[PDB]
Design a protein around this motif. Sequence first.
Motif, PDB file in Angstrom:
ATOM      1  N   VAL A  41      25.139   2.329 -56.939  1.00 52.05           N
ATOM      2  CA  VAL A  41      24.457   2.294 -55.654  1.00 52.05           C
ATOM      3  C   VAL A  41      23.065   1.724 -55.886  1.00 52.05           C
ATOM      4  N   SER A  42      22.720   0.670 -55.149  1.00 51.25           N
ATOM      5  CA  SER A  42      21.511  -0.103 -55.413  1.00 51.25           C
ATOM      6  C   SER A  42      20.534   0.030 -54.255  1.00 51.25           C
ATOM      7  N   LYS A  43      19.374   0.622 -54.529  1.00 50.51           N
ATOM      8  CA  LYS A  43      18.260   0.673 -53.590  1.00 50.51           C
ATOM      9  C   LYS A  43      17.258  -0.406 -53.962  1.00 50.51           C
ATOM     10  N   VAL A  44      16.949  -1.284 -53.011  1.00 46.75           N
ATOM     11  CA  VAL A  44      16.008  -2.370 -53.268  1.00 46.75           C
ATOM     12  C   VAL A  44      14.608  -1.839 -52.976  1.00 46.75           C
ATOM     13  N   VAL A  45      13.900  -1.445 -54.029  1.00 48.80           N
ATOM     14  CA  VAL A  45      12.470  -1.198 -53.929  1.00 48.80           C
ATOM     15  C   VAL A  45      11.814  -2.568 -53.950  1.00 48.80           C
ATOM     16  N   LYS A  46      10.519  -2.620 -53.671  1.00 46.38           N
ATOM     17  CA  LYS A  46       9.856  -3.895 -53.426  1.00 46.38           C
ATOM     18  C   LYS A  46       9.841  -4.693 -54.723  1.00 46.38           C
ATOM     19  N   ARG A  81      16.825   0.050 -57.960  1.00 50.49           N
ATOM     20  CA  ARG A  81      17.114   1.368 -58.509  1.00 50.49           C
ATOM     21  C   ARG A  81      18.602   1.650 -58.371  1.00 50.49           C
ATOM     22  N   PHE A  82      19.197   2.202 -59.425  1.00 41.02           N
ATOM     23  CA  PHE A  82      20.643   2.368 -59.504  1.00 41.02           C
ATOM     24  C   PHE A  82      20.989   3.846 -59.579  1.00 41.02           C
ATOM     25  N   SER A  83      21.838   4.296 -58.660  1.00 38.91           N
ATOM     26  CA  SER A  83      22.301   5.672 -58.595  1.00 38.91           C
ATOM     27  C   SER A  83      23.824   5.687 -58.573  1.00 38.91           C
ATOM     28  N   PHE A  84      24.383   6.892 -58.556  1.00 32.39           N
ATOM     29  CA  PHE A  84      25.820   7.088 -58.653  1.00 32.39           C
ATOM     30  C   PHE A  84      26.335   7.909 -57.482  1.00 32.39           C
ATOM     31  N   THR A  85      27.600   7.682 -57.143  1.00 35.28           N
ATOM     32  CA  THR A  85      28.248   8.335 -56.013  1.00 35.28           C
ATOM     33  C   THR A  85      29.617   8.822 -56.469  1.00 35.28           C
ATOM     34  N   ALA A  86      29.759  10.132 -56.640  1.00 36.53           N
ATOM     35  CA  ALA A  86      30.986  10.736 -57.139  1.00 36.53           C
ATOM     36  C   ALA A  86      31.711  11.452 -56.010  1.00 36.53           C
TER      37      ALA A  86
END
Lengths: 198, 122, 130, 200, 113
Positions: free
Chosen positions: A30-35, A39-44
């Motif tokens: 999961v990719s959040k575009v900071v400026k 940032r990469f997170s996970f979804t289980a």
Amino acid sequence: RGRRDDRGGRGRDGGDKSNYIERVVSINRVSKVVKGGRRFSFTALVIVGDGKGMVGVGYGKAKEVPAAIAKGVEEARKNFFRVPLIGSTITHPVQGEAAAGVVMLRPASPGTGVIAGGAARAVLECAGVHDILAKSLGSDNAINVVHATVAALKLLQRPEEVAARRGLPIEDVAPAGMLKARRESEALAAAAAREGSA
Amino acid sequence: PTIQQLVRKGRRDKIAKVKTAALKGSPQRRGVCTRVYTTTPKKPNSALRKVARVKLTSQVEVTAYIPGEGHNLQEHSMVLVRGGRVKDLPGVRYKIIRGSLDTQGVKNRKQARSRYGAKKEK
Amino acid sequence: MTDPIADFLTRLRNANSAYHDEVTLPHSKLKANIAEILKREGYISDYRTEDARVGKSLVVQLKYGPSRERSIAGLRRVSKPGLRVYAKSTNLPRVLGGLGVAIISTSSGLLTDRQAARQGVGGEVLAYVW
Amino acid sequence: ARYTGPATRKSRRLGVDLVGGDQSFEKRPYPPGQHGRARIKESEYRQQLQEKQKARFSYGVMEKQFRRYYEEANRQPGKTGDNLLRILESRLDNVVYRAGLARTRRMARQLVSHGHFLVNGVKVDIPSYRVSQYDIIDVKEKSLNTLPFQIARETAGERPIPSWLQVVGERQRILVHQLPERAQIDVPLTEQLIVELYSK
Amino acid sequence: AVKIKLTRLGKIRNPQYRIIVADARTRRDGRAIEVIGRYHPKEEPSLIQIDSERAQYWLGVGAQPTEPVLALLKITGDWQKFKGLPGAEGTLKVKEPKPSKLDLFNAALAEAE
RNA sequence: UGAUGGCCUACCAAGGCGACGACGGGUAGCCGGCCUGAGAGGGUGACCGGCCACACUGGGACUGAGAUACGGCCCAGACUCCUACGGGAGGCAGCAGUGGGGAAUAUUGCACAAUGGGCGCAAGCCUGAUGCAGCGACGCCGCGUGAGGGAUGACGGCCUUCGGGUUGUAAACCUCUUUCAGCACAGACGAAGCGCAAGUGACGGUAUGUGCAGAAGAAGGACCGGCCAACUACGUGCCAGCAGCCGCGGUAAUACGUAGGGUCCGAGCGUUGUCCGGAAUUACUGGGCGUAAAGAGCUCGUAGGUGGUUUGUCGCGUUGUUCGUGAAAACUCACA
């Protein structure tokens, strides 16, 4: 999910009751575009269950795979769900949906086996199913498929429900067909209880 | 959807989406090869792959690949072309069997040992 | 206007689903007997026919138990115009795997799956409710 | 036809006793090779493949003969898992092995290879022979007086004879009575995985 | 005209025969009007099982058995009914008695104990 | 004409055929079936069966109970052959096999012993049908190439961390009886067959059983990035190459190539070609059409579909029932 087999000199490993079969279907990055950055997170998506049949579904959105797994497990503990069946069959064919995902379920001859897709196999076998037939279509996905699995399972009830709704008992509600299937189910349960009594 | 309109017409499949075009869906054809000049693969797969254009006995002029490292075929050769799928090259969907009519098996091939016409090592 | 019985069932579906405890209808004998058998097996509370616009009218009370829950699970005409449906004595479909009930307009009148199976004639099935 | 390899390497790879008393497999429980130690990319695919490979390599049965076993098991009225285990427990060499008269599966394999057994009076050099209930079984004298077969018959302290097999005299008469029942076989790891995989 | 024929069946080394009634202009394995018997030289007693009264009818209307078919008829004594010269009697032999499926294991158990 | 019937013929009359698709173009023998598919559905008419059409081509005729008369005929062409050049003579889409096509499809074989057919009162005669053999892992089915003990694993390879490990209980060796193969010995059913003369099997001295001999004479084939069981090392460093997709090589690739080492299969093992499903990817079962594919620019209405409430009839549709019925094999159940 790395280096989980550890034998140390620490206290314990958090074992408890509810000897529940756990399963995880998939995690997408999961990719959040900071400026100017990502940032990469996970979804289980965690599905816990019991051989008796009762199921729980949890959803851990955590930047760590073990944290995501734990969050899914504890949400499934929070978000449980119960399913009625007949021995190792389903009480009646059903269809369930999650917004694009369609799942069809059907009782099978005793001992036929859980013939289901990869995600459905997990969502089912976590319950008390041993022999039903099922399939799925649409959504070209898995999260919605898993979500629709519980949607279909929710449409399950004993013949007592329709008996009370009609006021009339089984028969028309539960005809010999299911009558004998549930008789076999409950007789096997009673024999198991008698054997475990001693 | 208007059952009567179905009776009027309808219910045909979309398109065959044919793959093989040598002829007869042939498991293999044979013909004369030419134009064995090497061309370029896709940019990410930077290399150079040896191919040829074969006029098969099927009276169609197709493009065949030359698998392996070494080759035996040259101009005016009785090359046996089989169907293939090379996404690395544009418009190339054929190969030539090694250890066969014309093209000798690829020299010292040992990982495959059945493909590339590599006979049994004595 | 083409189909009256489909509108019958559609009104039942909407009225029950939209939590209404009653529905009113013109009284053509078809829907009259449909609701009659409906209360016979108990997916609705009670039907009563009185006088209205030139014909008569049937008013149906939907059976709700301890809460606003309907004994009806759903309604769907099957032998619709353009797709009228006929069935025989052997392959009499079992509603909800046999849980529910159906309508089969037999040559001997009107019967459900179980009744026709006990007897053994067929020819025209209709909607089923479970 | 017949395989070639021994059972120790397959035991190590599949990680289960295939000889039954393999000292070297428990010596090296990890799969053979430089990377039996190296962890495998785990998959339920691997679980099912390991199960079927254990089943194939345990009895000396071989793959093409094994697939028709599943197919005929599915054709049987009962559930395929039950029928497959029943029929795999219904082989001529299996019947003579469970009587404790052969020290190995390969024992009975080479015995039926040679023609040292007799069913109902007919000699069947075919290990794929099917032995029905109440079949009369006997052992020929040429093998009976052979020294290692004398050891096998007279030192038959091997695995006990199941209730559906009965050695009823010094003639090694295995007077079979019934089919191998699920409550009586005491089978190795189950075969529902095989049924579910093959059915797809 | 019409002839009663022997038609071949089974695999190669072991022959089997069905006694049919058919037109001559057919082949050995054409459409049988009616299968009236069966016979097998391969089996021990050359065992024959024949639909009797249909053969009686067809002989009455004028069916003409083939030479070995006629031989089989006499082997049955059927030709001694339509012609009826001495009268009809059981002429064919039979497979030997042989034990049953269950008595074999009964005797095996008796011998064992 | 065998019988009806513009079948044909003289006259009369003008009808008859179609949007529920004539007439045309292309295409194709067709079915029991077979195969896929859960089912529906889809694809095929291999072989085994059931019929039809056709037998250089095109026209015509014959006979007989019966003729597109494949090994009947005439006539018009083609082609070929022989020709006293005047002219005649020829037809395997029968069994072999020849040439050509094509990647690909085989013997110029044995007996009519059994079965079937024709002539003969019969004996018997005739059958390239049939029964058999030969040729092709063409395909299925079944068997063997052994087996046990045997160490701290010897010999060695490969990795190596340099310890040690994979090979590996593998091995060298000690024993087991040797299947099958090989040698000798007997060796047929099929045939209650036929013949009324004393005989009668191509198959086949094959199997079949009877002794012999030692592990003795019999294993290779794909993969190893993930999908997707099988990894490391070394080597080529955007080269060589591999890949069904996504995709691995610009010095350290488990993706290439090479070695072990592992996975699996096995006289097979992989590759190509094609079909079904997976596909719900024609959505009857079982789809949609605001923004993703999809409401014509809008009206009426022919054809068509399509129907309000209620009385009686008909029972066409529809259902219930009895029977004929749907060859055998099919396919399955059950028995041998």
